[PDB]
Amino acid sequence: PLKTQQMQVGGMDCTSCKLKIEGSLERLKGVAEASVTVATGRLTVTYDPKQVSEITIQERIAALGYTLAEPKSSVTLNGHKHPHSHREEGHSHSHGAGEFNLKQEL
């Protein structure tokens, strides 16, 4: 029901620190679960974004002097326009004249 997602990690001293992330996020906010991916510098977190999410991990990781990066990719758009237009231009008219009279007689 809450989302699960994984970050890049700038250190975490293994046995002594994977825990100081996980069981310190347990004291934080909006999150409910987390779990490390050791030997490759990665961490899972499982959170609800309806209050606080990224900051929860940033609180803990910055308050140890280490780095984090979540690959959030969160693009959305659907901002379509559709084709359209109009006109009208049917101009016209006509004209003509001539009255060639002549007389004199004598």
Rounded CA gap, 7 and 36, in Å?
Answer: 10
Q: Are 7 and 69 in contact (CB under 8 A)?
A: yes
Query: Which tokens go with 98?
Result: 């001539």
Give the SS3 label for residue 8. Answer: strand
Exposure string for 78-95, b = 16+ CB within 10 A, e = fewer: eeeeeeeeeeeeeeeeee
**43 CB-contact burial (10 Å; exposed 0-12 / middle 13-18 / buried 19+):** buried
Q: Phi, psi at residue 24, to the nearest 5°?
A: -115, -40
Q: Are 58 and 10 in contact (CB under 8 A)?
A: no
Q: Are 69 and 41 in contact (CB under 8 A)?
A: no
Query: Which tokens go with 55?
Result: 């900051």
Residue recorded with tokens 């002594």:
16
Experimental approach was NMR
Task: Classify residue 22 by its DSSP letter.
Answer: H
Instruction: State the binding site.
Output: 14, 17
Residue recorded with tokens 């004209």:
95
Range of the domain at 23: 1-70
Query: Which tokens go with 21?
Result: 């992330």
Give the 3-state secondary structure percentages of the chain, helix then strand then coil, rounded to 5. 20, 20, 60
Instruction: State the binding site for Zn(2+).
Output: 14, 17
Rounded CA gap, 50 and 69, in Å?
Answer: 20
Q: Which CATH number is 20's domain given?
A: 3.30.70.100
